[PDB]
């Protein structure tokens, strides 16, 4: 006689969660980072002891078929088509999965702060969007963990390491021009 719930309180964590909230779950392998998921629905055994949460998985970059790449953020996650059902007591705690822009905005990034720019197909490994804007001499996409400086000459952004330079030196500049200017 299961009925969908409004919210559930998770005691061991001692926090309450709602459908749409982003949560971390304890992985089968304890030496691995916490699973990231989005709560679609919360369901109960009538009035009973057991509670189960149905989630839509966020895939970590090294958790996907393609594997982590150099332009993937440390706190990056993919929104996928993969849903399955897990019990509530998995929930290790809560997290925020930010849009790309709003991640950039954050003053400081919490252990629990993530971001998403891709949709992921767990079966095929295909991404949406297919392609993204690239920068610097590497012609790699933006990695928000990487410090970059702007040559207004080209208006392109460069990793200091890829352009003759130390990081500390790059931070100095107000006046930058790449070698093609």
């Amino acid at each position: 006689p299961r009925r969908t719930l409004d919210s559930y309180t998770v005691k061991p964590i001692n926090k309450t969660v709602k459908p749409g909230d982003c949560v971390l779950m304890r992985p089968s392998d304890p030496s691995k980072p916490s699973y990231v998921a989005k709560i679609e629905r919360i369901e109960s055994d009538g009035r009973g002891p057991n509670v189960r949460v149905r989630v839509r998985w966020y895939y970590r970059p090294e958790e996907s078929i393609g594997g982590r790449r150099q332009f993937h953020g440390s706190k990056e996650v993919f929104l996928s088509d993969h849903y399955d059902t897990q019990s509530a007591d998995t929930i290790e705690g809560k997290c925020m999965v930010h849009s790309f822009k709003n991640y950039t905005k954050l003053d400081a990034v919490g252990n629990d702060d993530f971001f998403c720019r891709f949709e992921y197909n767990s079966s095929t490994g295909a991404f949406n969007p297919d392609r993204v804007a690239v920068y610097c001499k590497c012609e790699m996409p933006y990695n928000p963990d990487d410090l970059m400086v702007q040559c207004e000459g080209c208006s392109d952004w460069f990793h200091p390491a890829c352009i003759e330079m130390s990081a500390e030196e790059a931070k100095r500049l107000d006046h930058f021009f790449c070698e093609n200017c």
């Binding site: 304890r26 992985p27 304890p30 699973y35 993969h82 007591d89 998995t90 290790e92 767990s122």
Partner: peptide, 16 residues
């Protein structure tokens, strides 16, 4: 006590 999460396999279904 934090249960451990068991995930499924991509593109699979429950027969029941």
């Amino acid at each position: 006590a934090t249960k451990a999460a068991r995930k499924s396999a991509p593109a699979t279904g429950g027969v029941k």
